[PDB]
Amino acid sequence: AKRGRKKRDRKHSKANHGKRPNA
Amino acid sequence: TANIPNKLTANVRTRTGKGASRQARRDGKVPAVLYGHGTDPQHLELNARDFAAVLRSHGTNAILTLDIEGTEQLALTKALDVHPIRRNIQHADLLVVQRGEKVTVEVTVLVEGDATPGTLVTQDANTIEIEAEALSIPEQLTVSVEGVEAGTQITAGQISLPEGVNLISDPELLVVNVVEAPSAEALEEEGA
Amino acid sequence: MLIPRKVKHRKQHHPEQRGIASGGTSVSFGDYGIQALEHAYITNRQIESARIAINRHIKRGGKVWINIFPDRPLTKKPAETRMGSGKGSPEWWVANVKPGRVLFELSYPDEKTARDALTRAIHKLPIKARIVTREE
Amino acid sequence: MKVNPSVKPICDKCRVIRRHGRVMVICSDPRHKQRQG
Amino acid sequence: MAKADKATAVADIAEQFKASTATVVTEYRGLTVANLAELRRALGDSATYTVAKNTLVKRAASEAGIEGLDELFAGPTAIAFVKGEAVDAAKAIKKFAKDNKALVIKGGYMDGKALSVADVEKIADL
Amino acid sequence: LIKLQIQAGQANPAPPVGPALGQHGVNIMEFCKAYNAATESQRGNVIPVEITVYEDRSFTFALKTPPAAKLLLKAAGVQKGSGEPHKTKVAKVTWDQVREIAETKKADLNANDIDAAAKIIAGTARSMGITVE
Amino acid sequence: YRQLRLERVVLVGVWTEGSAADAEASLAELAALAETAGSEVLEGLIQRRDKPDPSTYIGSGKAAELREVVLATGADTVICDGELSPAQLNALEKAVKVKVIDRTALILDIFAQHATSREGKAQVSLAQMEYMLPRLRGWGESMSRQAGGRAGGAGGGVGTRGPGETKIETDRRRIRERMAKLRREIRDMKKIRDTQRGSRRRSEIPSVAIVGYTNAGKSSLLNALTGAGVLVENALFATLEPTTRRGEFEDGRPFVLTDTVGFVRHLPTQLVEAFRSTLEEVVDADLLIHVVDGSDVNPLAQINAVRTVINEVVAEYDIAPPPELLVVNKIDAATGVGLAQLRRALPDAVFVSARTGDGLDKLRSRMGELVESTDATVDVTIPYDRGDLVARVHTDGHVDATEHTDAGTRIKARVPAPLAATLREY
RNA sequence: GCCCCUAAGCGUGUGCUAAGUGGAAAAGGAUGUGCAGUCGCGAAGACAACCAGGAGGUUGGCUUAGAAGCAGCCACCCUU
Numbered sequence A: 001a002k003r004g005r006k007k008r009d010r011k012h013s014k015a016n017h018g019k020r021p022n023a
Numbered sequence B: 001t002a003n004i005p006n007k008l009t010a011n012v013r014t015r016t017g018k019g020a021s022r023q024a025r026r027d028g029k030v031p032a033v034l035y036g037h038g039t040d041p042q043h044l045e046l047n048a049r050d051f052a053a054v055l056r057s058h059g060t061n062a063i064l065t066l067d068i069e070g071t072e073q074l075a076l077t078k079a080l081d082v083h084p085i086r087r088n089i090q091h092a093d094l095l096v097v098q099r100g101e102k103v104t105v106e107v108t109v110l111v112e113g114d115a116t117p118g119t120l121v122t123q124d125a126n127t128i129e130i131e132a133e134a135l136s137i138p139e140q141l142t143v144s145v146e147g148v149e150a151g152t153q154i155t156a157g158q159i160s161l162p163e164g165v166n167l168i169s170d171p172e173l174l175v176v177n178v179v180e181a182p183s184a185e186a187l188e189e190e191g192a
Numbered sequence C: 001m002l003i004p005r006k007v008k009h010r011k012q013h014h015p016e017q018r019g020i021a022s023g024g025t026s027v028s029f030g031d032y033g034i035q036a037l038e039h040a041y042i043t044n045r046q047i048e049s050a051r052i053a054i055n056r057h058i059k060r061g062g063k064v065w066i067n068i069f070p071d072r073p074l075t076k077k078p079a080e081t082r083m084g085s086g087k088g089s090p091e092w093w094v095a096n097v098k099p100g101r102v103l104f105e106l107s108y109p110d111e112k113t114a115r116d117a118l119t120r121a122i123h124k125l126p127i128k129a130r131i132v133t134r135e136e
Numbered sequence D: 001m002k003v004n005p006s007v008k009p010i011c012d013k014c015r016v017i018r019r020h021g022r023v024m025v026i027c028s029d030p031r032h033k034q035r036q037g
Numbered sequence E: 001m002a003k004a005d006k007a008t009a010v011a012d013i014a015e016q017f018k019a020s021t022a023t024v025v026t027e028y029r030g031l032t033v034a035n036l037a038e039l040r041r042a043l044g045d046s047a048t049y050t051v052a053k054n055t056l057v058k059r060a061a062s063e064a065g066i067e068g069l070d071e072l073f074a075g076p077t078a079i080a081f082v083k084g085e086a087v088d089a090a091k092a093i094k095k096f097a098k099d100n101k102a103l104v105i106k107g108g109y110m111d112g113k114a115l116s117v118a119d120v121e122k123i124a125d126l
Numbered sequence F: 001l002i003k004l005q006i007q008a009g010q011a012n013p014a015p016p017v018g019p020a021l022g023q024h025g026v027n028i029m030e031f032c033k034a035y036n037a038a039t040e041s042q043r044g045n046v047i048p049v050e051i052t053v054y055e056d057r058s059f060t061f062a063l064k065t066p067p068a069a070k071l072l073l074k075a076a077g078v079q080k081g082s083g084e085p086h087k088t089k090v091a092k093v094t095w096d097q098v099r100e101i102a103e104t105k106k107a108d109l110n111a112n113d114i115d116a117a118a119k120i121i122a123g124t125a126r127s128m129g130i131t132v133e
Numbered sequence G: 001y002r003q004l005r006l007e008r009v010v011l012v013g014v015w016t017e018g019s020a021a022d023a024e025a026s027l028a029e030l031a032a033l034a035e036t037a038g039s040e041v042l043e044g045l046i047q048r049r050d051k052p053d054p055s056t057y058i059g060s061g062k063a064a065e066l067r068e069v070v071l072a073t074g075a076d077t078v079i080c081d082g083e084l085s086p087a088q089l090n091a092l093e094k095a096v097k098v099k100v101i102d103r104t105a106l107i108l109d110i111f112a113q114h115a116t117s118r119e120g121k122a123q124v125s126l127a128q129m130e131y132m133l134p135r136l137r138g139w140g141e142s143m144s145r146q147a148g149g150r151a152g153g154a155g156g157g158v159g160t161r162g163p164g165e166t167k168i169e170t171d172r173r174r175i176r177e178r179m180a181k182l183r184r185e186i187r188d189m190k191k192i193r194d195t196q197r198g199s200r201r202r203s204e205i206p207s208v209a210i211v212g213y214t215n216a217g218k219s220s221l222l223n224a225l226t227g228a229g230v231l232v233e234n235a236l237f238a239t240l241e242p243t244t245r246r247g248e249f250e251d252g253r254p255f256v257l258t259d260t261v262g263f264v265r266h267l268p269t270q271l272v273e274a275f276r277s278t279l280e281e282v283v284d285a286d287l288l289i290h291v292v293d294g295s296d297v298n299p300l301a302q303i304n305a306v307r308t309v310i311n312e313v314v315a316e317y318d319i320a321p322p323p324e325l326l327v328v329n330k331i332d333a334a335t336g337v338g339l340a341q342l343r344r345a346l347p348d349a350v351f352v353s354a355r356t357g358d359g360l361d362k363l364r365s366r367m368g369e370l371v372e373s374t375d376a377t378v379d380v381t382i383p384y385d386r387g388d389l390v391a392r393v394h395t396d397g398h399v400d401a402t403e404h405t406d407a408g409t410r411i412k413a414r415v416p417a418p419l420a421a422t423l424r425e426y
Numbered sequence H: 001g002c003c004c005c006u007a008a009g010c011g012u013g014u015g016c017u018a019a020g021u022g023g024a025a026a027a028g029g030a031u032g033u034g035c036a037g038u039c040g041c042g043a044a045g046a047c048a049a050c051c052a053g054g055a056g057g058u059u060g061g062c063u064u065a066g067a068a069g070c071a072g073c074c075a076c077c078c079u080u
């Protein structure tokens, strides 16, 4: 389950501010 | 029992609140109030390391001469606010007292001997309410279970009190009862 | 295991775990305690396993106090069923714990084996813990 | 060796050491040679 | 180390310097007790085989004030007593320089002054 | 060099003393001659023997004696004891030969010290509970 | 493994053959087994049918009689003292309208709870699973109304319907497959037993074992005859794994004494398959200890049933059956005045009581007697320069060490081949 | 966001990291390395070192093939 973890651990960037859509 | 008031200092606090108290506790201070019969609601700022140095050595009922903007006032530590998981000190009540006054406190009691070695000794309540003079408040009243058979109740009448100290709580509540020591069958048959 | 004799409401909501424990946060009966540091749904069998793991290491002496009681049931919808048509039957019995809440208490003479037995108890619980005493 | 994620001393004759990035137990009795990874 | 108990003991051990006039100084080299039990039990009549391991023969002798010597720490130095029985324990341990063979002659406290080795043998005779 | 605390009423009856005569390249019963001529002529109140052969094949003893714990084994009473420490009393000892409690051996294992009597008043005594009253 | 609630049971059983007393004897084990699983037993009806019915085990009307009794006592269960097919136990369910779960299922389940070691758990799931393979359509809820089908079969083209197989096949394949993984897993565990018994294999030692049906003792005889305290619960199947301890008589060779699981009558031929541990032992022994209770109505019965299982073992492994000693226990505390009968014609009817009353003196002295031949005997002249001749001469297992002299030692003892060996120089 | 791709800082001052940590993760294991107090000894030269020190009645019991300081263990009031 690498793909879901990499897709929803992208919200921890400074340009997303802790939140992303569908994650 | 005649002890010496622990010298200290405490400046009066400018601004009260939640954020101001948190900012004060972020700098090494402890907030406090100094109510009592003198009618001095005094919003103070103690120091944490000195206050814990007084507390963890001279008991919890520690008399404090304290310099509040240039005046030494004797004050007894009434109640404390300790955080349950950080175990620091978050507040302090300092009841203003003067000498000669009989005041009521709650001291902790301890045990001395071992037992008879075939029994288990269990504390029940390690607090005793007593009425003593302000510069006479004792600490760590000692109870002795030394070669004492099981079936024993040491209630709150058999404690020996020092000079001038009267009781408050009745002499019918248990302090140390000594029950006969169980075995492995009584450990497996108690709690299932 | 430890089960209640009867309960008023058989199917209940999940007990919300938020905030710090405002009652229990001191050692009251015994000499050494186990103070929780995280939230958990500590169940029936975990309490039984920790009590067994204490009594295996203190063989004959001292009391042991279980301060918490599992009386909050959790249900479980049965096997391979789609989602719908009723809350399931009550399966698990759970006690709710918060940080600070002292779980187990122990009196024993030997101070080394007391902390040994309490670490043996701590290793069966689903959270982190501590060995606090009845003094400061 | 008995390699597993939890090395710790067994007897009163063995030490732990940190060597080449791995933490390992070394003993005079060679049954107790453990290393982590 | 703690100077309280050690100083108040060994300063009086070296204050027995001030009361007496003769104690003999030997060397300890370590053996069984089972071969030194006969030594201290038989020919130490009222005397000792004490270490003073390398400890306090010059610093804790200032209450005597007659410490006009340097070699009180030099090598190992013993404190066997011949105050009451002068020639007895002295030559009774000097025979263990041919029996025990784990000591030599150093010399020591005779009359409070520093005597030569040849003449302390001459007065251990005379 | 093997010492002992085995029983002392022996005339080569058993594997303890018989093979002790029959070891190390000596005569068969020449130490047995002197042993049953001297020691158990003094009725044999417990006597160990440490092997101190010279080149001329001889080794002599003293009046060997248990310490102040089990002096009663030599002097007064029964030949028994217990097995745990600090246990029940078995017999009692008076104070006649209590300057003779030290008249057997005043040694230590190490190089450390002396006065095995002031040792023996509580050293090798609390291991069983054999008493002096 | 399944765990719910009962405690309300009405037991039933066809008396196809056997004496009257013999018949209710079976129903009785069922009571003890039922209670050993912990459930109150209410009534209990037995019929006399020369052979069961292919639809309802007991009958048609008898099923009707049971229907009312289940409404009377409200018993939530019914257990049948026999092995019953999937069909019979499904029809009898619409009749009485309650649990109609047979005996083999009681025993298989007791083994689930009472068994601890991981190995023991695995063998159980095999059994329970092999018992549930032949019951899938019957538990046909997964196929209950699985009529959602009717898939078109134009075929020779798109169907996109994936099932390229019937659902029963696909489902059967899964249970059969899991059963196969476990099968290889269990056979591997064999190497762990063998390796945990390498020391005993080598250094040949004696090896008495204790066979016997359940509740006959066995683990009482061991806890007393040697030392040690193993579960000695008064219930059924209290030992679900073999134990071994050391002990000896004059011949200190270990007389290693093993304790085993219990052989009830009519094994469920399932969980027992994997209970090979007890049987691996029976094969590799120097004696057996059939323990039988005198507090039993007819002791001779269990003697034969148990002996039968021992029969099959010797048959497969082609072995000369080991010497076997049958020791009666529960005597003395003998809740049995029918004691004399056995004594009239029973070998070694020692009044072993194992509890108070001992009785173990004669057995111990008569135990080493049947064990396999010793093989050490020797008399020699040892020089005084021993210090070594003691090799094991005195310090050995059975080394006699029973003769002496002044000259070294005219020892006259016994010595094994690898110990004093040939070294001894007369 | 500012070394080059790629516009703008291989920016300035004080510290940390040796893991490419930075640039995924748990119960738990652990002689990493900075900080801050505490506790005895505490630049007495304590501590480490070269080292005399080797069967005290030391083959004790509980017992004896011996119970060969020493299968096991329930105690170290012990001293030039």
Ligand SMILES: Nc1nc2c(ncn2[C@@H]2O[C@H](COP(=O)(O)OP(=O)(O)CP(=O)(O)O)[C@@H](O)[C@H]2O)c(=O)[nH]1
Pocket: G213, G214, G215, G216, G217, G218, G219, G220, G231, G232, G233, G234, G235, G236, G237, G238, G239, G240, G260, G261, G262, G329, G330, G331, G332, G333, G334, G352, G353, G354, G355, G356, G357
């Ligand atoms: N009254 C009495 N009971 C005895 C005596 N000897 C043994 N028992 C009974 O036998 C039981 C012990 O044997 P047990 O451990 O049950 O044998 P087991 O075969 O291992 C039981 P399992 O079926 O689990 O293997 C005890 O419950 C005890 O009541 C006796 O002399 N008198």
